[model samples]
Target: EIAKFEAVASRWWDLEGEFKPLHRINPLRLGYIAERAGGLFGKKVLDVGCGGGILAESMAREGATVTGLDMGFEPLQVAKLHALESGIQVDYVQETVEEHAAKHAGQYDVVTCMEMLEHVPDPQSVVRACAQLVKPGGDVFFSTLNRNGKSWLMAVVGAEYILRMVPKFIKPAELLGWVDQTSLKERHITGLHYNPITNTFKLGPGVDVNYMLHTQN
Candidate 1:
C-alpha cells in the first residue's frame, strides 16, 4: 500500500487527479467531524493514515492542533510540502498508528481515521491504537466503504476499476464489533452517498455503500 501510494504522492493535492473524489467529499467529511465534536477550535486532533493530509489540514484550518500520521514517507513529504505552501500548520509524521500510540497514548482531544480501516492488515488493531491515542472523553471518527454487493459494484468495480478513485469496502457489523472490543463507545453511524451524475457527495440515511462511524473513548 505504501509503495502504491508513493507512486502518486505528488498528485495528492491535484483536484483533477486520482484523489479528486476525496477532495470533493472533504467539505462533507470536515463538516461532519466539526459538528459532532462541537467545533474544532483549540482541540488536539490526530489524523491516522492521513495520506497527503487532506483532512488533517482541514482540521488545522478550523483551529485544531493537528497531527497527520501515516506510514508512507512520500505521502508525508508531500503533505508537509503542501502544508508549507498552503501556509497551514500541520505536523506530518511518518509512523504507524500502533507505534505512535505507544508514546502518545491518550493525548488527543479527537482522533480521525478516515477511509483507512480496509487498507490495513489488522483493522481491529488500528481501532485499538486509535482508541488509545485519544483522551478518555475524546471523539474518534472512522469512515469506510461498506462491504456488500452494492459496495462491490460501486466501490470496487465502479470506483476502483472504472473511475480509479481509490479503495476498500468493511461491513458495518464487523466495524461495530471492533468498536465494541475497544474502550471506546459507539456514538453514531451515518452514511455518505456519492452522485456520479452531479459529481458530489451528501450525508444520507443508508449504510449500504459508504458510511462513517463515531465512537467516544
Candidate 2:
C-alpha cells in the first residue's frame, strides 16, 4: 500500500496543486479537532491513517508529542522526510491502527482517526482500537462520510462532476455499518451524527447523516 502511495508520496505536500481541494475542507476539519483538543502543550497524541503526517505534524507544532500510523510506507517515508526537513520531529510508523493499538494499548491522550474510515476493511475494528489506545477520560475523534442519497449525490456525484473535489467515495450502503452511533456511545464514546447539507439531504426522512464520534473522561 505504501508502495502505491509512493507514486504520489513526493507530491503529497503539493498543497498548491493536486491536493488543493482538500485545503479548504481539511483546514475546517483540522480546526474542529484542534479546537476541540484544546491545549496540545505536553499532550500525547496518535494520528491514525495519518496520510503523509499532515495532521500529526500540525499537532506536533502545537507542542504535542505526536505519533503517526499508516498502512502506506511511501507516504510514511514522505512524512518522515518532511518532518526532518521542517525539524518537527513527527514519528511515522507503518501499520494499521488496529495492529498498532494491539501492540501499544492505552498509550495516547488523544486519538485522531480522520477521513480514512471509508477505506477500512472493517471500520469498527479501527474504532474499537482507537477506543482502547485512549486512556480513561481521554478522547477519540472520528470523522467520516454519510451513507445516504444526499452524500452520494453531493459528495460523490457533485464533487466528482461539478467541483471535481475527489474521484470516488464509497457509496451510501457501504458506509451504513460504520455509523451505528448508539453502538459507539455504549462503548464510552459519544456519537453525534449530523448532516451539514439539509439543502440536499432531507432531515426527517430516510437519509443517513454524516457523523462524528468522541468521548471525554
Candidate 3:
C-alpha cells in the first residue's frame, strides 16, 4: 500500500487527478469529524496515515494543533509542502501509528485514521494504538469501506478495479466488535456515498458500502 501511494505521490493534491474522489468526499468527512470532536478549536489532533495532510491541515485551520503521521516519506513531503503553500501549520511527520503512540500515549484530543485500516496487515493493532493516543473524553474516528456484498461490487469492483480509486476494505459490524477489544467505545457509524453527477459525497444511512466509526473512551 505504501509503495502504491508513493508511486503517485505528486497527484495527492490534485483535485481533479486520481485523487478526485478523495477531494470530493473531503468536506463530508471533515464535517463529520468536526461534529464528533465537539469542534476542533484549541484541540491537539493526530491524523494517523494522514496522506498529504488532507484531514490534518483542515483541522489545523480550525485552530487545532495538528500532527500528520504517515509511513510514506513521499506523502509527508507532499503534505509539508502543501501546508506551507497554504500557510497552514501542520506537523507532517514520516512515522507509523505505532511509533507515534509509543511516545505520545493519551496525548491527543482527537485521533483519526482515515481510509487506512484496510491496507494494513493488523487493523486491530492500529485501532488499539489510536485508542491509546486519545485522551480520556477525547474522540477517535476511523473511516473505511465496509466488507460486504455491496462493498465488493461497488468499492472493490466498481471503484478499485474499474474507476481506479485507492483500494479499501472493512465491515461496520466487525469494526464495532474490534473496538470492543480496545478502550474506545463506539459512538456512531455514519454511512457516506458519492454522486458522480454532483461530484460530492453526503452522509447517508447505509454502511454496507462505506462508513465512518466515531468512538471515545
Candidate 4:
C-alpha cells in the first residue's frame, strides 16, 4: 500500500488525476464526520491513513485539532507541505496507525479511517486500534467499499475494469459481527453512491456497494 500510494504522492491534490475520485468525495466524507461529531470545533481529531492530509486539513478547517498519520514518506511530505501552503495546522506524522495508537491510546475526540481498511492487510487490527485510540464518548468514523456482489461489480468490475479507477485488490467492508467485536458501537450506516458525471456522492440505502459507518466509543 505504501508503494502504491507513493507512486501517486504528487497527485494527492490533483482533482483530475488518479485520486480524482477521492477528491470528489472528500467534502461528503468530511461533511459526514463533522455532522456526526456535532461539529469538529475544538475537537482532537485523528485521520488514519491520512494520505496527503486530504481529510485531515479539512477537519482542521472545521476547527478540530487534527493529526494526520500515514506510513508513506512521500505522502507525509506532501501532506505537510500542502498544509503549509493551505494554511492549515495539521500535525502530519509518518507513522503507522498501530504505532500511533500504542503511543496515544484514548487520546482523540474523533478518529476517522476512510477508504482504508480495504487496502490494509488486516482490517480487524486496524479497527481495534481505532477503537483503542478514541476517547470515551468520542466518535470513530469509517468509510469503505462493501463486500457484496454489488461491491464486487462496482468496485471491482465497473470501477477497476471499466473505468480503471483503482488497482486490483480486496475491498473489505466490516461485517456487522465484526463491528460488534470492536469496542465502538455503530451510530449510523449510510450508503455512498458516486455520480461521476456530476462528480459527487449521494447518500442512499444498502451497503451492497459503497458505505460509510459512524461509530461511537
Candidate 5:
C-alpha cells in the first residue's frame, strides 16, 4: 500500500494527473467536514493517511491547526514541499496513525481519514487509532468506496479501468463494524454521486459506490 502511494507521490498536487479524482472531490469533503464539525476555525485537526496533504492543506486554509499523518516517506516530502510552496501551515508527519495515536491520544478536535481505510491491511486498527486520536466529543470523518455490484462496476471497472482515477474500494458494513468496535457513534452517512460525462460530483442519498460517514468519539 505504501509503495503504491510512494510511486505517485510526486504527482499528488497535479490536478491533471493521477490524483485528479481527489482534487475534484476535495471541496465536497472539506465542506462536509467543516459544516458537520460546526466549522474548523481554531480547531485542532488530524488527517490520517493524508496523502500529499490535499485535505490537510485545505483544512489549514480553513483556519484549523492541521496535522497530516502518513506512512509514506516520499508522500510526506511532497506534502511538506507543496505546503511550503502554497504557504499553508500544515504539519506533515511521516508516521502511521497507530504510532501517532500512541503519543497524542484524545488530542484533536476533529479527525479525518478520507479514502484511506480501503488501502490499509487492517481497517479496524486504523478506526481504533482514529477514535483514540479525537477528543471525547470530537468529530471523526471518513470517506471511501462502497462494496456492491454497482461499486464493482462503477468504481472498480469504470473508475479504475476506464477512467483510471482511483485505485480501491470498501464496504459500509465493514466500516460501521470497525466504528462500533472502537465505540464511536455514527452521526451521519451520505453518498457521493459522480457523473462521468459531466465530470462532476454531488452528495446524495445513494451509497452504492462512494460514501462518507461522520462519527463522534
Candidate 6:
C-alpha cells in the first residue's frame, strides 16, 4: 500500500485557492451530496481516505461533524493544521478505514471515499467495511478511475498530456479490484447514478440523465 502521501500532501492545499479548476468544476461529482448535506446539521460524516481533509472540511462547513481517516501521519498533520487555520473542526485520525470502523461502529450518517479505490490495496473489502459503518438509510459514495478505452483516452491523453492533471511520466492502468454497478450491489450497496448530462442524480422520478456507468474499476 502506498501509504506515503508526502509527495502530494501540500497539493491538497494548493488546490483550494488557485487550483479550484482541478477539483471544483465537476459539480456533478459531489455537488449532490454537498447540497444534500446541509440538512445534516448535527449528523456525523465519515471521510475515508480523507487526505488533507479538504473535502471533509467542506462537509463541516455545511454543519455536519466530520471525521477524516487516512493512513499517512504527515498528511493528517497537514489536515489538522488546515482545519485549525480555517476554524473548521474536523477530527483527523491516522488509520485505515477498517481500523477506524472497528473502533467506532455504526457511526456516520454519510461515508464518502473519492478517488482512492483505484489506488488502494484492497478496494472491495474496504468498501464492504464502509457498508457496516453507515446508518441504515445513510449514503456511502465512491469515485474511481474506470476500466475502458475512453477512460484511458480522457485520463491519460486528456488529463495527463494536455491538461497535465497528473505527472507526465505517469501511466494510466486499470485497478483490478472493482468492476460494475452489479458488483457493488451484490455487496448490498446501492448508489445514486450521477449522470453529468442532466446535471442531476436519478434518485426518485425525475429525468434520469446521469451516466449509467463509470466502468473505471
- For candidate 4, what's the RMSD? 5.0
What TM-scores do the predictions have?
Answer: 0.87, 0.71, 0.86, 0.83, 0.86, 0.63
Kindly report which residue pairs in candidate 6 clash with one another.
145-216, 146-216, 147-215, 147-216, 195-210, 195-211
lDDT of 3 by residue, 1-217 (tens): 5565455766778877776666667788899999888999999999987877778888899899999887756667889989988999998887668888999999999999885687677788899999999999999999888764133123321333222322247777678878999989998888887665975678978887678889998
How many pairs in model 6 have backbone atoms within 3 A of each other, for residues 3 or more apart or on separate chains, i.e. clashes? 6
Clash statistics: count for each candidate: 0, 2, 1, 0, 0, 6
lDDT of 2 by residue, 76-192 (tens): 777898898999988888877877888988888888887567655667677778877887767678755554412322332133222221112344344334434412332222222
> 27, model 3: CA deviation in Å?
0.6
Per TM-score, the best of the predicted structures is 1
Q: Of 3 and 6, which scores higher on lDDT?
A: 3
**Candidate 1: tens digits of C-alpha lDDT, residues 128-183:** 99999999999999988876413322332233322232215588999999899989
Give all candidates' CA lDDT scores.
0.82, 0.62, 0.79, 0.75, 0.81, 0.55
**Model 6 score (lDDT):** 0.55
Which has the higher lDDT value, candidate number 1 or candidate number 4?
1
Position 20, candidate 2: lDDT: 45
Q: What TM-score should be assigned to candidate 2?
A: 0.71
lDDT of 3 at 123: 87
Provide the lDDT at 149 for model 2: 17
How far off is residue 85 in model 3, in Å?
1.5
- List candidate 1 stretches off by more than 4 Å: 1-7, 149-167
| Better-scoring candidate (TM-score), 1 or 3 | 1
